[PDB]
Design a protein around this ligand. Structure first.
Ligand code: QWT
Ligand code: MG
Ligand code: MG
Ligand code: ZN
Length: 330
């Protein structure tokens, strides 16, 4: 044929939901043969006309995406290619919000989506602090500073150097330097050690908010533009509790598998077991309510204020999920 396979058709039908919060990302992972990041990135690049805008050869895009997807670990429960695909797709929906219409350049949009795609690549499924405490090679290479996030960037960029992988080959040096700086600034902002300063800056921006040509945010300097993109990808990274409950609970199962495996490695080595990593002293439900109350709701309430009323349904889902987890605590 020159026509898709029946499995390719069922996948194409699921990918019609790519512009919606609550995409069936686990179903896309199954239908694509464990290629959700490649098919979601390819769909988004075609939808936003990024191949034409950036003169990206389609074979180069697909080669890079498969290579990037292959550097995520299928034997890590949470920080895998499905999480990367989910953050990409969630960023893509946030970039389309009414309040940001015509705000960002094509290069800023490419930076946010590419950053989302690479932001956890080659994640070993243990925390920065675990890597530091174990004298791991990664912690030594990055001098204990944003160890994982430095690594994700270095890998994401180094893979551009593999055979037919340079998706930026037709960008000018000016475009490449601007893109690279923005991608670095965004992925380094995914380190949870930066969360309280990012949130403080987002709150300051909401308090001093300006809108222009009616209803659209005014961002007239790099500091403000990069801060919104950093907070946007950080919101996407912390989006699991804002999703329909069938999706959220799969994310909770996966993060707790990864945390409990780290806690097993800590216990067996005589280390202090990290917060929420002890399967013998766990409350999954209390931990989700704490996560929402102290991290996810303060961030998403502030994001919702910046883009008000655009994120009202996302904030309502978060509040409903929080009440659901609270109601299951013995
Ligand atoms: C779908 O689910 C989760 C997805 C991801 C995480 C993460 N978590 N983090 C780190 C976040 C910071 C806390 C440590 C964990 C690591 C990541 O790097 C990431 C990987 C972002 C976690 C998910 O949920 C698992 C429950 C954690 C409970 O998080 C909290 C926080 C705060 C208080 C609190 N404060 N004051 N009083 N209580 C209680 C509980
Ligand atoms: Mg592995
Ligand atoms: Mg990360
Ligand atoms: Zn992540």
């Amino acid at each position: 044929f020159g026509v898709k396979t029946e499995q390719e058709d069922v996948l194409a039908k699921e990918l019609e939901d790519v512009n919606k919060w609550g995409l069936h990302v686990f179903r896309i992972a199954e239908l694509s043969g464990n290629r959700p990041l490649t098919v979601i990135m390819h769909t988004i690049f075609q939808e936003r006309d990024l191949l034409k805008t950036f003169k990206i050869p389609v074979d180069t895009l697909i080669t890079y995406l498969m290579t990037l997807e292959d550097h995520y670990h299928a034997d890590v429960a949470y920080h895998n290619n499905i999480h990367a695909a989910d953050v990409v797709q969630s960023t893509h929906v946030l970039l389309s919000t009414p309040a940001l219409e015509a705000v960002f350049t094509d290069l800023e949009i490419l930076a946010a989506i590419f950053a989302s795609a690479i932001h956890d690549v080659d994640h070993p499924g243990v925390s920065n602090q675990f890597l530091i405490n174990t004298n791991s090679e990664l912690a030594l290479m990055y001098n204990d500073s944003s160890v994982l996030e430095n690594h994700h960037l270095a890998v994401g960029f180094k893979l551009l150097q593999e055979e037919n992988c340079d998706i930026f080959q037709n960008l000018t040096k000016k475009q490449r330097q601007s893109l690279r700086k923005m991608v670095i600034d965004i992925v380094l902002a995914t380190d949870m050690s930066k969360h309280m300063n990012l949130l403080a800056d987002l709150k300051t921006m909401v308090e001093t908010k300006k809108v222009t040509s009616s209803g659209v945010l005014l961002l007239d300097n790099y500091s403000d533009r990069i801060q919104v993109l950093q907070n946007m990808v950080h919101c996407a990274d912390l989006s699991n509790p804002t999703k329909p409950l069938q999706l959220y609970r799969q994310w909770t199962d996966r993060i707790m598998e990864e945390f409990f495996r780290q806690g097993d490695r800590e216990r067996e080595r005589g280390m202090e077991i990290s917060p929420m990593c002890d399967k013998h002293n766990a409350s999954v439900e209390k931990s989700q309510v704490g996560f929402i109350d102290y991290i996810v709701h303060p961030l998403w309430e502030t994001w919702a204020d910046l883009v008000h009323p655009d994120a009202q349904d996302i904030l309502d889902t978060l509040e409903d999920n929080r009440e659901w987890y609270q109601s299951t605590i013995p």
